Amino acid sequence: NPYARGPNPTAASLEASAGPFTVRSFTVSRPSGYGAGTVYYPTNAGGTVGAIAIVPGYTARQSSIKWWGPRLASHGFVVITIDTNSTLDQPSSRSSQQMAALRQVASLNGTSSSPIYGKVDTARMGVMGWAMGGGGSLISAANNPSLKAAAPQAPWDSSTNFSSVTVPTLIFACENDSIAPVNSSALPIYDSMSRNAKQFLEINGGSHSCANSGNSNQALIGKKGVAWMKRFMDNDTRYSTFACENPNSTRVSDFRTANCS
């Protein structure tokens, strides 16, 4: 597998705060099409790596989803976390901005003067995000089927029919979400997808911010996010077991998966 990076994983290595690669980061000087961004990247990765763009929810900023930057980058990805043009941007706008962030990562990859010149395989991209940013990630996936993976958290959109999504999609849900309730939001969205590899992981007792920075379930959430991205973005079947497993955990109140391998 030409995309495989790093050593064979274990549950403990995936549950730790960081993976095997050193992470460097920089703030984007001139954001193109979004408000602000921070790029996280691995050093001495052993090859080009995929890129992931992460967008927050309504009223929120990078801080809400920042943990994923070093968490994912340390396992071999270039990650861009963004602030939107406005904190009041809706899901469609968030999707457009998420794609603009991936675009800028691609721009930086091809620009001789950037720190990440030649570090990215621009044909391998992923999308993540929280709440309206989760809805945005799903819209991105629906409109851009070449994306290799999606892993939104506590997603919301005004529509729940995401049957057009063919991208491998993992949905993190928060059991006690009162903003985007699981039964009216995450679950119907999940249930609408009939054409892809998909997964649904619901966090026991979780509020709407249960997958955000500083959360108490980073061991599990981070393991699953990294495993999903590794399996689908890198086609790395060393991660199939972790990507597909139904975790035996009291931290999980519901688990669903389909077409996973």
Residue numbers in the entry: 1 to 261
Verbatim from the authors:
Specifically, I. sakaiensis adheres to PET surface and secretes a unique cutinase-like enzyme that degrades PET. By hydrolyzing PET, the enzyme produces mono-(2-hydroxyethyl) terephthalic acid (MHET), TPA and bis-2(hydroxyethyl) TPA (BHET). The enzyme is named PET hydrolase (PETase) for its PET preference. PETase adopts the canonical ɑ/β-hydrolase fold, in which the strictly conserved catalytic triad S131-H208-D177, as predicted from sequence alignment with homologous enzymes that exhibit PET-hydrolytic activity, is found on the protein surface.
We then used the inactive variant protein S131A to prevent ligand hydrolysis. Indeed, S131A variant showed very low activity comparing to the wild-type protein. However, attempts to obtain complex structures using the S131A variant, which crystallized in a C2 unit cell, also failed. In both crystal forms, the R103 side chain of one protein molecule penetrates into a surface cleft next to S131 (or A131) of another protein molecule. It appeared likely that the R103 side chain occupied the putative substrate-binding groove and prevented the substrate from entering. A comparison of the wild type, S131A, and DM crystal structures suggests that these mutations did not significantly alter the overall protein fold (Cα root mean square deviation = 0.144–0.2 Å).
